[PDB]
Enzyme design. Structure first.
Site, PDB file in Angstrom:
ATOM      1  CG  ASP A  80      -2.282   0.891   0.906  1.00  0.00           C
ATOM      2  OD1 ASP A  80      -2.373   1.534  -0.193  1.00  0.00           O
ATOM      3  OD2 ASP A  80      -3.182   0.955   1.819  1.00  0.00           O
ATOM      4  CG  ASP A 248      -6.204  -5.652   1.551  1.00  0.00           C
ATOM      5  OD1 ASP A 248      -6.819  -4.817   0.850  1.00  0.00           O
ATOM      6  OD2 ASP A 248      -5.934  -5.454   2.754  1.00  0.00           O
TER       7      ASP A 248
END
Ligand code: 726
Ligand code: 726
Ligand code: ZN
Ligand code: ZN
Lengths: 341, 341
Positions: A80, A248
């Site tokens: 991320d 996720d």
């Protein structure tokens, strides 16, 4: 293999199954991407950028050879952008050592470069829920400007541009017109994949599915769709039904005694499992895992985590097989009937 | 295989190497016996009787099929007697549920019967250190009366008498005459193996070795010698040099960031390991394990524990091979020089 190729092998309704080819491996979709530090199947793992920035730092990871060498994982890794304030970015102080850190689209891309990840997320602003239309618009517009800056920073790093992929993140809260503007802006910039951001932030499943109903079709059909932060097994099934390809979620690893099963989640610490010889995987018994976790044994937590990761990967395999066979609608119905029985 | 046969294959000084044959497997000696709940090599594992008495209880373990089925371990298991007050035994209240429990030689043998263990320990009294001669004598004399009661209870349970083995425990604190009286009493009763009890209770390595110097030769030479509660790797080497065949210790599993290495113990949490790419096993790097444990990841603790168990088993293999090859004295010297460098 190419730097990035997504190919759709089969479709059923809005659901798709296929493959992402990257230099470090093939990712079968729909895919679940587990946290890489959770255990020693998955085609791609997650690296937690925010944590890695603070310990040991991105520069130290690069000195140790990058995340692939550091973790012993030679397949793709997704990171991320670290942001999950001004037009430049965000400033913050580390609780671990008091060190000062700034984060911007440019710095986020460089951190992910130093980590060596294969799928790089654009630096965005995850809009809180609920949000007024004006605040959701302002936040989304800033995220789109930051997406362009992320694109340019990524493209200016030759090793990254030639070997990694960059995903843009759609924002717009629950508002259809803002989701459309965001999708249009991201497609105009151009990304390898498109994430649906700004969900799983307190809105609840019905509202999330409502937003996915109109939001996913706005993204390019021919690129992967990643729903960030999702989710529970039933969230995954419903999101696949709405065109999502990648997932996720911290839940399998966070789940404290909670095990995911085809008959729903269970808390293995409950006394009703103390004499239950049925395997946790429907071959350690529920009774033995119960005993280990009640005794505080790290083995129990590890076996629970491995069970949950394996459950999620079995779920994704069944999803992929059922879409490829044209029986995903029936699978989803059968899954929900048993999971919620 | 027989119920119990111990055969000495080779000797060097007081050190011995050989095998214990039991119905459920062969145990190579000198042997390290890890706690069975520590991880998913070892020829025998430990079951912690005291813990199992309290949760879920010995009767519940028997209802679930015994410890072998419960834990998924089909090889030998050793259980302690649970005692580690009156002539009858000991009374105590459970902190887990307030339930009342008494423990006596007879009840201890029956608990170990219900657990299904292969090596059963006689019920003794571990004398505190330091102890006066009078108190050490009184305690040892009671332990010898309890050893006879343990022998009789074990022999009266046909399945146990025909399929398991019973070890007696020598007491006597640090006093040579009491150790001799205890060894004589145990040999007169007759046991399958003989433990040296009452050590590793605060006396320190020099004193422990001093007591082993005279105490181990008092036990029957042709039966295995088990030093209870020992120990650190250097304790094991020195105890093998003094005729010990079997070891148990909570240290590898208790060791919080501590790793055992051929260069001594290290604390992997120390910042000096943050960039150390050398494997922990001299192939996860020290740097990655450091990161996992500093991050609080259960994976790090599991990898540390597996490393320590493996280190202990490699130590025991090197001990067995060096005795069998007539180079154990040299191994012990080389081991200490590097471990303490
Ligand atoms: C729960 N609902 C949830 N999580 C959202 C994350 C964070 C994902 C991230 O969430 C943890 O980090 C904090 C995980 O740890 C990371 O995995 C390693 C994971 O990175 C992929 C979002 N990230 C961005 N950049 N933008 C989003 O709009 C967004 C939305 C989310 N909803
Ligand atoms: C540290 N010094 C240490 N530990 C002694 C244990 C306990 C062994 C036991 O120690 C933990 O239980 C509490 C372990 O947990 C057990 O493993 C499962 C282990 O049982 C073999 C002794 N046990 C008896 N019955 N008699 C002893 O004289 C004796 C001496 C010890 N010295
Ligand atoms: Zn399972
Ligand atoms: Zn190792």
């Amino acid at each position: 293999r190419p730097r990035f190729s997504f190919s759709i092998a089969a479709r059923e309704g809005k659901a798709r199954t296929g493959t992402i080819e990257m230099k470090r491996g093939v990712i079968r979709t729909p895919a679940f991407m587990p946290v890489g530090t959770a255990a020693t199947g998955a085609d791609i793992i997650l690296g937690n950028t925010y944590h890695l920035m603070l310990r040991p730092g991105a520069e130290r990871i690069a000195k140790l050879g990058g995340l692939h060498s550091f973790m012993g994982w030679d397949r793709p890794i997704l990171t991320d952008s670290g942001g999950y304030q001004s037009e430049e970015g965000v400033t913050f102080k580390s609780h671990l050592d008091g060190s000062r850190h700034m984060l911007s689209p440019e710095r986020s891309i460089e951190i992910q470069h130093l980590l060596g990840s294969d799928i790089v997320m654009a630096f965005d602003e995850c809009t809180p829920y609920p949000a007024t239309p004006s605040r959701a618009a302002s936040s989304m517009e800033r995220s789109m400007r930051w997406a362009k800056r992320s694109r340019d920073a990524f493209d200016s790093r030759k090793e990254q541009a030639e070997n990694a992929a960059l995903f843009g993140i759609q924002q717009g809260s629950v508002f259809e017109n803002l989701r459309q503007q965001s999708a249009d802006a991201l497609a105009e910039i151009g990304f390898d994949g498109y994430a649906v951001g700004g969900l799983a932030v307190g809105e609840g499943q019905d509202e999330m599915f409502r937003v996915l109903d109109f939001s996913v079709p706005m993204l390019p059909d021919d690129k992967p769709h990643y729903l960030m932060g999702v989710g529970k097994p039933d969230d995954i099934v419903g999101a696949v039904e709405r065109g999502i390809d990648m997932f996720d979620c911290v839940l399998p690893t966070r789940s404290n005694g909670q095990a995911f099963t085809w008959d729903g989640p269970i808390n293995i610490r409950n006394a009703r499992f103390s004499e239950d010889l049925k395997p946790l995987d429907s071959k350690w018994s529920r009774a033995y895992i119960h005993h280990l976790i009640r005794a505080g044994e790290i083995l129990g937590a590890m076996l629970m985590t491995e069970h949950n990761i394996a459950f999620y990967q079995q779920l994704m395999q069944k999803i992929r097989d059922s879409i490829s066979e044209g029986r995903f609608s029936q699978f989803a119905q059968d899954f929900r009937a048993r999971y919620f029985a």
